[PDB]
């Protein structure tokens, strides 16, 4: 048979299928998608004018900036790909330093300075490991905002311009969120944060390709009123949406969660071969523990003082971790692996 659908030319128009629940929905609106698994092929950050960028780093370094920390994982890949082109620009301009770009290890730590746009000592270090002779507080950070999108099949370019002043808030041009009925997402080039209402609205699972340190902009937040920072599962300082969707009954903010892993997967389920029980007799909440010993022994029996099941768990490169509230029932013994 025949049906009736509203379409608009300047919105997301099309038909879309949901296999479970067997719902074909067609119309026009906003399609918020999970960009984390496809990002390396789908998106490429690109600076507006390598010449204008090169002069601003010179002007920064003259004003005492030794280096940069990338805000996002994409931004780091950008500095790697452009470094050969920048250093060629610097030599023609007799600038007395060169630009070196290192890996992205763990949390994308936060720098305190800014690179102002234009109209030992010898290296301007981008990223790499943490270094005291070029400390974070001497480095610029979160210096790009999106100017325009390069819309296409296959690759999409994201052209960025240097900001005019410093800001701790993530760049909202890259961010999105959406909710319909009883599912909700906050989403990013690197975060995918799912919450749903089963009797009560709560955080259901998340996917992290990077762990960053910008603040999540309120303007792209669901339910951002009356949030208590101590109750945000994903901590505000690592970009947790300041939202009641970022809650989970019986858990508090995972400031000591395994965020060092730099890339990890959060949801609510037991780790393989362990059990968690709700026991007031448990140890107090503390820094997150790995369910596998330093010696590969699995830690069988866990408990939590007043959390709620299923237990908050993180999955990482080297194994499975439980939220801070979960503790070994045999108390501190053995060869334990703990986060910071």
């Amino acid at each position: 048979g025949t049906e009736n659908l509203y379409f608009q030319s300047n919105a997301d128009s099309g038909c879309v299928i949901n296999w479970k629940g067997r719902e074909l929905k067609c119309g026009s609106g906003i399609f918020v998608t999970n960009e984390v698994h496809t990002w390396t092929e789908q998106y490429k950050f690109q600076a507006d004018s390598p010449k204008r960028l090169s002069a601003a780093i010179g002007k920064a370094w003259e004003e005492g900036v030794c280096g940069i920390r990338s805000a996002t994982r994409l931004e780091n890949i950008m500095w790697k790909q452009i470094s050969n082109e920048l250093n060629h620009i610097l030599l023609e301009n007799d600038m007395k330093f060169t630009v070196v770009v290192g890996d992205v290890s763990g949390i994308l730590a936060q720098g305190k300075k800014m690179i102002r746009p234009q109209p030992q000592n010898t290296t301007f270090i981008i990223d790499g490991p943490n270094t005291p002779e070029c400390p974070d507080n001497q480095r610029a950070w979160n210096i790009w905002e999106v100017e325009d999108y390069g819309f296409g099949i296959f690759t999409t370019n994201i052209w960025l311009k240097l900001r005019d002043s410093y800001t701790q808030v993530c760049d909202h041009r890259l961010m999105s969120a959406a909710i319909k009925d009883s599912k909700a997402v906050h989403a990013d080039m690197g975060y995918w944060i799912e919450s749903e209402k089963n009797e009560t609205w709560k955080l259901a699972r998340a996917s992290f390709i990077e762990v960053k340190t910008c603040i999540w902009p309120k303007s792209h937040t669901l339910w951002s009123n009356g949030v208590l920072e101590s109750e945000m599962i994903i901590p505000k300082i690592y970009g947790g949406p300041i939202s009641q969707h970022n809650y989970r009954p019986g858990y508090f903010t995972q400031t000591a969660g395994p965020w060092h892993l730099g890339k990890l997967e959060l949801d609510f389920d037991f780790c393989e071969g362990t059990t968690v029980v709700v026991d007031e007799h448990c140890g107090n909440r503390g820094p997150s523990l790995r369910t596998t010993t330093v010696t590969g022994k699995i830690i069988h029996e866990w408990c939590c003082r007043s959390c709620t099941l299923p237990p908050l768990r993180f999955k990482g490169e080297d194994g499975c971790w439980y939220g801070m509230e979960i503790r070994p029932v045999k108390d501190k013994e053995e060869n334990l692996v703990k986060s910071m």
């Epitope: 393989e272 071969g273 692996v337």
Partner: antibody, heavy 119, light 112 residues
Framework: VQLQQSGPELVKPGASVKMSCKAS????????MHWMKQKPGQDLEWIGY????????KYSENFKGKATLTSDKSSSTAFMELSSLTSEDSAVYYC?????????????WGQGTTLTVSS | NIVLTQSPASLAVSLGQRATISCRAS??????????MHWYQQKPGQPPKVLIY???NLESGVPARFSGSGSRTDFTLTIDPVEADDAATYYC?????????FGAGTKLELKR
């Protein structure tokens, strides 16, 4: 935890071989079968690992195109296959129980499968 | 990658003496407060066998004359007193970061 590796192999250049490693006494939480290549009296190279129950696999960069890890749960067996074969591949391939990244050591080892690549 | 360089390449020691082998890593092998370093003994024609796991832990059922020490980049295997059985090659290995890497080896030769 007892590891039994396949027998020796003689293979023509450019062909392919698939050797096996069955693991008795394992649990889901351990039982990462690591694979190493050792030419006679030379350094061991790490290829990767596979968990017969999890299908978790990780390859080293040097071997990404060369080796392919597969698994059969019921057999709790690991399989490693070596793509286009060259004389540089003639060596002993060791199977050995390990763990994830910052976890444990090489507890137990299979006996080793010797491969000779020759026309 | 983390490259382990072992010294010396080959060692000759008399019965009952003290043997010292060292392993030098290109990057720290330390994480979570542990040193992810191990020592192996390989008799010829045989799989390797673990002696020290982590920097300084005697493997279960390995004679207590074997001992390990160190942190970060520098580590040392000590055999005391070395006996007739220990004629073998000795490997260090790290699993702090992928790929797991081994030392080149130290061939121990006994002096009698």
């Amino acid at each position: 935890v007892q590891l039994q590796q396949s027998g020796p192999e003689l293979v023509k250049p450019g062909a392919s071989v698939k050797m096996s490693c069955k693991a008795s006494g394992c649990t889901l939480t351990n039982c990462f079968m690591h694979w190493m290549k050792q030419k006679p009296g030379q350094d061991l190279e790490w290829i990767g690992y596979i968990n017969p129950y999890n299908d978790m696999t990780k390859y080293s960069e040097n071997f990404k195109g060369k080796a392919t890890l597969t698994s059969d749960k019921s057999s709790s067996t690991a399989f490693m296959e070596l793509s286009s074969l060259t004389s540089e591949d003639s060596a002993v391939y060791y199977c050995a129980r390990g763990y994830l990244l910052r976890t444990g050591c090489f507890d137990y080892w299979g006996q080793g499968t010797t491969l000779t690549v020759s026309s | 990658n983390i490259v382990l360089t072992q010294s010396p390449a080959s060692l000759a020691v008399s019965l009952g003496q003290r043997a010292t082998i060292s392993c030098r890593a290109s990057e720290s092998v330390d994480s979570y407060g542990y040193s992810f370093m191990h020592w192996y003994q390989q008799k010829p024609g045989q799989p390797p066998k673990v002696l020290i796991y982590l920097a300084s832990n005697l493997e279960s059922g390995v004679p207590a004359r074997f001992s390990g020490s160190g942190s970060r980049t520098d580590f040392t295997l000590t055999i005391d007193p070395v006996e007739a059985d220990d004629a073998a090659t000795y490997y260090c290995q790290q699993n702090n970061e992928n790929p797991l890497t081994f030392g080149a080896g130290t061939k121990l030769e006994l002096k009698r």
